[PDB]
């Protein structure tokens, strides 16, 4: 505790849900600084110590808490999901905004890049594709990973390397849970 | 582990010196809320949600106390082993595609934060901007470090440049992540 | 509508 001697602890509870509540896994992690020393795992069903640092806690924890923790899987995990998640986060549907833009200059023959910006949507599941005259392009195509905005919305940018021509129609097709019908944006020279 | 959904109901972060703490609820990697430990109030990131669910702030205070307790016990046991300083990384990108004169938001995502103490600020052309700024709590990472995001509302102009300034004990000199309407 | 939370267990 002399001068720049920083100390912190972390408690990280986890309710892993698979297929609604058909399967739940409850994990409770006990971290000292950045080191996980103790851990409860519903799969294992017991407070096993992770590292040396957590040697002194196992026995005591399984004594005093084992029963109280196993229960949280129902009173905390299943409960919060069915009683609070269902009406809020699991019901959140924000529709994507979709726009196409060219990376360089508009002229009559350039190896440019079309960018399809898909933004402010929720939840994560989404599908974005490029078409050139009705045929899907997959070769000079790339999309960023899912970008989490931190405000409960995502965005993904999808690039298509191409060479514009006359009467050539490019389309960005987006399918998302919030859209009863897919969105299609068009771009021409 | 894996799943279709992940809930973290009661993340506790307590550090010293300073008795600095944080209590949050996450779902699918997003902040449901954080309990304001001074106001003793649950602060929901999405107001609408608070209309349908709730959480007694006392639960956070009770557990933040246990954080004060377990820490110390562990600071004594670890033979007083201090935390090792990591170096933060920042990325800047707009919420929506940039259009001259149209209201947007600039986002600064700072990752690999450890310990969870940091100052993140915005510079319009090289001058600190303090209005229209919002910051998230500290999100947990798989490796136990943290990320956090800051936001700046702004109007895109040809005569404007931006920088996200991050200050951390793991940097020798404040990091400036530059950004400007391309 | 009242959410629960995982309790952080004390040591010693």
């Amino acid at each position: 505790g002399d001068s720049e001697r920083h100390f912190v602890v972390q408690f990280q509870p986890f309710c892993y849900f698979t297929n609604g509540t058909q399967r739940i896994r409850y994990v409770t992690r006990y971290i000292y600084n950045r080191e996980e020393y103790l851990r409860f795992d519903s799969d294992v069903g017991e407070y096993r110590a992770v590292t040396e640092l957590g040697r002194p806690d196992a026995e005591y924890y399984n004594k005093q808490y084992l029963e109280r923790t196993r229960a949280e899987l129902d009173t905390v995990c299943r409960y919060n999901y069915e009683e609070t998640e269902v009406p809020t986060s699991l019901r959140r549907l924000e529709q994507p905004n979709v726009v196409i833009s060219l990376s360089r200059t508009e002229a009559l023959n350039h190896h440019n890049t079309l960018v399809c910006s898909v933004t402010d949507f929720y939840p994560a599941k989404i599908k974005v594709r490029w078409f050139r005259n009705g045929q899907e392009e997959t070769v000079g195509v790339s999309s960023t990973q899912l970008i989490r905005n931190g405000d409960w919305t995502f965005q993904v940018l999808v690039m298509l390397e191409m060479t514009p021509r006359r009467g050539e129609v490019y389309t960005c097709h987006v399918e998302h849970p919030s859209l009863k019908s897919p969105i299609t944006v068009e771009w021409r020279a | 582990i894996e799943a279709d959904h992940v809930g973290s109901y009661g993340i506790v972060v307590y550090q010293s010196p300073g008795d600095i703490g944080q209590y949050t609820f996450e779902f699918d990697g997003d902040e449901l809320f954080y309990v304001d430990l001074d106001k003793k109030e649950t602060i929901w990131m999405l107001p609408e949600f608070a209309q349908l669910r709730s959480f007694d702030p006392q639960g956070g205070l009770q557990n933040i106390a246990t954080g004060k307790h377990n820490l110390g016990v562990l600071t004594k046991r670890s033979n007083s082993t201090p935390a090792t300083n990591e170096a933060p990384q920042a990325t800047v990108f707009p919420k929506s595609p940039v259009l001259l004169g149209q209201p947007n938001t600039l986002i600064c995502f700072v990752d690999n934060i450890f310990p969870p103490v940091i100052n993140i600020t915005w510079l319009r052309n090289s001058k600190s901007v303090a209005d229209g700024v919002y910051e998230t709590s500290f999100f947990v990472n798989r490796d136990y470090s943290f990320h956090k995001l800051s936001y700046l509302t702004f109007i895109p102009s040809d005569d404007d440049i931006y920088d996200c300034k991050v200050e951390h004990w793991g940097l020798e000199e404040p990091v400036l992540k530059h950004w400007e309407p391309e | 509508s009242r959410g629960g939370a995982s309790q952080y267990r004390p040591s010693q």
Partner: T-cell receptor, first 111, second 110 residues
């Protein structure tokens, strides 16, 4: 193994009564109750125990103080007849799903 | 809040004393019953989790009915010595404090 200062005290309206408690159980949580015919036990003030203090169900007219792990005191800065009862101090683990240990009690009368 | 049906009860040694309790906060997950003998403070007798629906320990058995938010403590084979005031408490899935009830006074006639 919980102790309370006045095991019985009689004061007058307006007086500044101060019941105090002590617990060796080395518990983090401490509570102050009051038993009354028709209400059973009612939490008044409690602590996560450092220099912590939180309002219970009926905190009005009261103020608590937890100067140390084992000391939790209840204070009435202006006694009232409505405060004539039996005060029960208690201690337990951080939590609420944990067993609570009570003291003997304390009868108080203001007049 | 917590409620205890039997405002007061008297039974002759050997029978079965049934106590009742109810609450209406589905978030309640832990319910401990305290026993208080005249002269001293209350003390924890038997506690149950919302997970199960029954808990036994001697003559004492808690009957927990998740829905309808009912709950009851059965003392089979009564006995003078079990005669004080019993308290039904409860706490939520968050870690908040326990909330007791009116409390039933039991008298066991030898």
């Amino acid at each position: 193994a919980v102790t309370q200062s006045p095991r019985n005290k009689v004061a007058v309206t307006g007086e500044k009564v101060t019941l105090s408690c002590n617990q060796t159980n080395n518990h983090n949580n401490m509570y102050w109750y009051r038993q009354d015919t028709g209400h059973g036990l009612r939490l008044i003030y409690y602590s996560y125990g450092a220099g912590s203090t939180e309002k219970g169900d009926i905190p009005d007219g009261y103020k608590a103080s937890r100067p140390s792990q084992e000391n939790f005191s209840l204070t009435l800065e202006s006694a009232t007849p409505s405060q004539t009862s039996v005060y029960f101090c208690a201690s337990g683990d951080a939590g609420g799903g944990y067993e609570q240990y009570f003291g003997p009690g304390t009868r108080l009368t203001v007049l | 809040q917590v409620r205890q049906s039997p405002q007061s009860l008297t039974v002759w040694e050997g029978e079965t004393a049934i106590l009742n309790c109810s609450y209406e906060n589905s978030a309640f997950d832990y319910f401990p019953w305290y026993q208080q003998f005249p002269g001293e403070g209350p003390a924890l007798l038997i506690s149950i989790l919302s997970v199960s629906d029954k808990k036994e320990d001697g003559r004492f058995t808690i009957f927990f009915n998740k829905r309808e938010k009912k709950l009851s403590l059965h003392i089979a084979d009564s006995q003078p010595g079990d005669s004080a005031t019993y308290f039904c408490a409860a706490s939520a899935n968050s870690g908040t404090y326990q909330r007791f009830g009116t409390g039933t006074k039991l008298q066991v006639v030898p």
